[PDB]
Amino acid sequence: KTVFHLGVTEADLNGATLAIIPGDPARVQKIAELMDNPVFLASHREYTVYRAELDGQSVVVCSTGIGGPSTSIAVEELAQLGVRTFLRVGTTGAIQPHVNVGDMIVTTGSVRLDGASLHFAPMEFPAVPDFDVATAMKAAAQESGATVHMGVTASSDTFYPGQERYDTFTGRVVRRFQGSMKEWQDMGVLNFEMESATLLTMCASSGLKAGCVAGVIINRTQKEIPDHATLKETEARSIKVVVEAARKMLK
Amino acid sequence: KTVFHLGVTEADLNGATLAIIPGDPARVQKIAELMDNPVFLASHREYTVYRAELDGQSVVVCSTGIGGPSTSIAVEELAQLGVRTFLRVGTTGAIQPHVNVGDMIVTTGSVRLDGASLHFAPMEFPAVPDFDVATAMKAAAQESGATVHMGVTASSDTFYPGQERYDTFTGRVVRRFQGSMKEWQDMGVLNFEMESATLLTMCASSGLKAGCVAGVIINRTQKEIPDHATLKETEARSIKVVVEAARKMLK
Amino acid sequence: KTVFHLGVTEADLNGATLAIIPGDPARVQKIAELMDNPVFLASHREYTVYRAELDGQSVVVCSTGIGGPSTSIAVEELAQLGVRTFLRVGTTGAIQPHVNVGDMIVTTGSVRLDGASLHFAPMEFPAVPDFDVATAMKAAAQESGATVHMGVTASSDTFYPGQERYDTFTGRVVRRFQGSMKEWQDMGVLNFEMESATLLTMCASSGLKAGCVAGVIINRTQKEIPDHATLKETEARSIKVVVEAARKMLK
Amino acid sequence: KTVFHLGVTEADLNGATLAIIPGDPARVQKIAELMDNPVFLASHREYTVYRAELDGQSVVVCSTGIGGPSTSIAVEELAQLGVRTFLRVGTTGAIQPHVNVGDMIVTTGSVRLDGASLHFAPMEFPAVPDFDVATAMKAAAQESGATVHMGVTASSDTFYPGQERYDTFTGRVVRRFQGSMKEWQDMGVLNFEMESATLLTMCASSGLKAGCVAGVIINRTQKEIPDHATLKETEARSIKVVVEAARKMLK
Amino acid sequence: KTVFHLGVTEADLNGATLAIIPGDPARVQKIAELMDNPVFLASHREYTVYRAELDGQSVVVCSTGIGGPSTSIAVEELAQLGVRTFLRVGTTGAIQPHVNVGDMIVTTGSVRLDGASLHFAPMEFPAVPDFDVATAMKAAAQESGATVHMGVTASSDTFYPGQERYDTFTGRVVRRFQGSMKEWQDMGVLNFEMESATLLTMCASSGLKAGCVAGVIINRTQPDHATLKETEARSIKVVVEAARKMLK
Amino acid sequence: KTVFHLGVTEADLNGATLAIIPGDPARVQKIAELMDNPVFLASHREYTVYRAELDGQSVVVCSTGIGGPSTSIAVEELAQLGVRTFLRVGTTGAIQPHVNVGDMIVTTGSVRLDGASLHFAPMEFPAVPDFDVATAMKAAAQESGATVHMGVTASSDTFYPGQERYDTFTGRVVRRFQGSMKEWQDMGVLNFEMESATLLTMCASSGLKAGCVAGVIINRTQKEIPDHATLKETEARSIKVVVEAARKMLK
Numbered sequence A, B, C, D, F: 001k002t003v004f005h006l007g008v009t010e011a012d013l014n015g016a017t018l019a020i021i022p023g024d025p026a027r028v029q030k031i032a033e034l035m036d037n038p039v040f041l042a043s044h045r046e047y048t049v050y051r052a053e054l055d056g057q058s059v060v061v062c063s064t065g066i067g068g069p070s071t072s073i074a075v076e077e078l079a080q081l082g083v084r085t086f087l088r089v090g091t092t093g094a095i096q097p098h099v100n101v102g103d104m105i106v107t108t109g110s111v112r113l114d115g116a117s118l119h120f121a122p123m124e125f126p127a128v129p130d131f132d133v134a135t136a137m138k139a140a141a142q143e144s145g146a147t148v149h150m151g152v153t154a155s156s157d158t159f160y161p162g163q164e165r166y167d168t169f170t171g172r173v174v175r176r177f178q179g180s181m182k183e184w185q186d187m188g189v190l191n192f193e194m195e196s197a198t199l200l201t202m203c204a205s206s207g208l209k210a211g212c213v214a215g216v217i218i219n220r221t222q223k224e225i226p227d228h229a230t231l232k233e234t235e236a237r238s239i240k241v242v243v244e245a246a247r248k249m250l251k
Numbered sequence E: 001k002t003v004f005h006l007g008v009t010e011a012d013l014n015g016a017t018l019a020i021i022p023g024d025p026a027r028v029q030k031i032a033e034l035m036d037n038p039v040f041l042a043s044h045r046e047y048t049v050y051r052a053e054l055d056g057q058s059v060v061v062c063s064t065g066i067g068g069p070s071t072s073i074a075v076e077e078l079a080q081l082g083v084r085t086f087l088r089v090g091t092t093g094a095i096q097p098h099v100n101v102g103d104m105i106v107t108t109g110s111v112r113l114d115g116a117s118l119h120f121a122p123m124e125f126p127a128v129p130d131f132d133v134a135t136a137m138k139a140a141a142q143e144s145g146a147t148v149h150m151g152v153t154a155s156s157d158t159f160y161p162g163q164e165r166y167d168t169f170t171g172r173v174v175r176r177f178q179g180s181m182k183e184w185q186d187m188g189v190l191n192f193e194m195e196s197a198t199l200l201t202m203c204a205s206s207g208l209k210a211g212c213v214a215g216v217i218i219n220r221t222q223p224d225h226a227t228l229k230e231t232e233a234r235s236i237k238v239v240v241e242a243a244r245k246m247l248k
Ligand SMILES: O=c1ccn([C@@H]2O[C@H](CO)[C@@H](O)[C@H]2O)c(=O)[nH]1
Pocket: A023, A065, A066, A067, A090, A091, A092, A093, A094, A159, A163, A192, A193, A194, A195, A217, A218
């Protein structure tokens, strides 16, 4: 009745079949408050859960935490409660020279640099978004006036070595990931983040519609540091975009 | 100056940057004749090459042969000659009950059951189309009156065991592929074909735009045998759709 | 230096070189209050950070969130701030019939059913604890009156299919994990949890000492969803154990 | 009982249990005309099929197209019609410095750089010819006065990156294949082609007799694109050799 | 000068470039005694080393022990001492119903169910013999009266689960190997043994000529000491005649 | 009641449930003579078998030969005859600069660079010793006054390329093992040997207790050659340690 990790019931969802799923629990209330009649439902672990109304339809907002494992729990438990459509809104590091801080990226497929995707489909299976969700995300992002890029996202189980960061305690990156950022750059991959491979593989193989849109908070090829103002704005724009994409998915 | 397998030069293409790539050499002239001023350029091995004009712009039509290996040669040599966009038009076997003979399927991602895709990117990389191509294919299919489905395609290096056919000389399927059709069915995969994993992986990792649309010529769950009239009309519909998708990509 | 996710500086840690790392942010304060002079340091995302004093030495308490990815961030950032010893205290499902709810399990090695361990060492590398940490954990468990088991732990990037749970939205488990619980049971594996493979592999390959002790909240011989009744008592026992193990590691 | 792709019946084969299988459809008629009573049977896609008589016995000649996938279809469909012995005659690039254009290479085993072989046997299985076929090819080649080499062949699903060619559109080779040509050279591998791994693994695991003889059209210690001038004479030599090898296999 | 494990020098081999390599140290002297002037050179661990002369050419006989790891040490150290051709003579279990106890099997390729082969070449590389050795082994086997089969051999790092034996302490076989004997049977594999994948992969990727001939001592679908001892005697007569064919 | 390779019966073992398993047949008699009433039982292939009495309890001493394959046979056949605890005493090459010739290493986990471990458990499974055995080995080693190290061992199916030795016939190491010694050094791995991965994986997945202690006979980072004197003392100390560890394992 009450799902084990999220701490909500189906009735708590007031009929919602669509969820917006940010990684950060603090983003949940901010998203819900862009909609009508936001209601705090539960907070346990990394899972903060709200409901709100969008054009008269109930929508759930639930954080995932960082990484495929905590994401897979949230998606599973929301699906048990009747949710069928999942819109991730994230932050991301761009790896292409002119994909700038404050731009939006809508993932068309993910490099599966994760482990949880393999718990739903073998590696051969594409970590692909639902076409309708990706279409809605692209439309919402473009209509907002943001600069939007569609393309492949490298989705890593780590922030540090799997994104080929060397400014770390050991200063070492395992053989598998040595040279990997340049490899992805040369293959036209746009960005790194940490949940899309699990989310897209799990949903595409389980009868659930999913997509990922993320605001660029750092460009690994740029040396200029964004300010708080640009970042706040990037975060605000990303949540307005994902709510508009949700509007486009409702029926 | 003339590429080794296709036997054409850049000048022969008259400025074409877009190619339509059927599997079957006999389909090339049929596609070219839906366009203006079709001219035969070359035929070597499985590669029949025509040029034509679509809304005043040059377009190449070039067969790939069956399979990723022969496809990879055609795409590479056309890219050497300035082609940047590749629209595959194919035939396919549907594996879902209500995806009927005569319908069109636009691949949104491929299960990489091939070998050539791994010569361009490791297995983790998604075999996904260019989003604009997939969008153009869906619109062109709808506008032609076809019944169209968007979704995941299983792309196999074999027609027989990799599509879990038992009606064969040995009657056996290696362990890897035992139960695989039901596995993909339960994961929502729509169809089997034999070139999309290579094509989409090669192009998405190499700066080229690609997509795949295919006419359903058999449904592996249905007992009814489709007519000859049905299969001819399916091929004719698929080529009308791919040419209209090309038109959408050119402006 | 202020680390990117934890939001603390090295000076904030008051010279601590040992951290206690529960999964659940709410367990952090409870652990800190078994020690002297607990002080809240920061809370961001799934990371709640306290410090305290044990026998006159500073100790950090920091949550990891669920899964290898969020654990890998906490461990990395704490190691950047001088932490060298990491004691995970967790919850776990037993897969051997005579391990009871409320028992403690100290992992002697993990089955790497995760992805983040591969971002530190190839699969051949053993997910093994530091021997002193495992020894201290066993002694602390015995001395606290707990029933303790030493053995191999299956460490999964999912709660659901990677632990072969079938009471789920789809009711399916991917091929890889079909039969896996009985496989591990027959191999003598004691339990499932979700962070030890990442933690132990990253620490054993990076010059950091780690171990994992977890309280049994469910026996998978009975059911899949843990009972809420016993959670508080089991958690209270496990945190008494881990603080006493920390005491043993401080000398 | 016309097979799906080849367009021939068992009666068309006139009792043939041996097939000569070149890659290039244009080579089929040339091979058949070295025998008695050549008869054209069909041409569909990359499959041109002739029958002829050798020492009074029927032989079938059928092209495979480039790559494992199209080869696998031809072998299966021929086996359905009673063919049990398959002699591939190919073209190849030598990787050893003193294996010269115009030499013949008889494969004793293939490096499985393909995908279709895995649709018949897991990677551990050897891509090995039938001993009688290899013995016949060596004898035919030596008796003809050709310069012949026996050894391992690297059999690739691509012409370009899997043969470590760099004079391409991207100029890049994926990590897996970087340094691979020198690796095979140092291991004594003789040559690159594109069908033997599939053909030999499929046949050796399916009760069929197969081998591969190929004429060297380029030496890769020199250059990447084969010279046109020497193609005709090398091919003429190779097909004389394969017809004699077929004579030896008959009785 | 003196290799690390075998305990012999290059001069001890008297110019030999061919070695006969049985698995069992007790078989070494038996092989050397089919040749001229057999002399014991060393015994350390599983490595018993003799030299003899065949048609006036020095030949070395050296056991490998069971498994790829010990085999790889012997081959490497013999190669350091100038050996270039390696003839394995083994025992084997047949898995095809009419490959009988006492028959000889000459491996044309091995299923690599081992680990040491991967220390010389990636899994894609074929574990295949040198063609001249396989040809010499077939001719020697035929010319000695044996019933000989040419074909694929499954070469396992274990005697028990990797050959899908269930008559064991746990009675279990790991998932990877469940159904595997029937899989190989259906693929036409002739036999199981424990060294050919390592030996053939190592040699084919290192400029060394190698082959494997083995006497069938058990059929997994279907014997006496007299049968079993006759089988070993036939196998070593075959391998020595194959060496003669390789020398001149 | 007579196993296939070891040539002993259960009655020959006189009730022993514990075996000391050196690699070298010549070491067996030396170990047995440290105990009471040593009795030679059999010698076949690399398997020399003795029994003796330790504190009035029968113990078996049985060599394994070099490598996981011959080890796996010895362990299996001894387990069939009632042995449940296996103490390996080995020689080893240290790879860390201050792990000196004559030191003792007790393995806490093995890098599985072998093949036979995969015949008992998939690669994800940890090659870890029984905790009681590792505890007894550490105690026996430290009480002897030796310099003892606990840590990870790289366990290789080869002495030469898998330990990244270049002073060889070819002077080459396959790509997999290029750079591998430095990789393990930087990961804190203490040493190379050739049986622990198979032994520990087999036993930990089969209900048998196992551990490995080894005397350092070479340090891959030191140029000084140890004396014959130092090596003989090292062997003598290693066998006294393993016998004392055995004493500790008997109730
Ligand atoms: O360079 C970056 C920036 C952001 N993230 C996202 O931010 C979180 C952690 O910083 C994760 O959920 C991840 O998706 C990255 O992975 N990499």
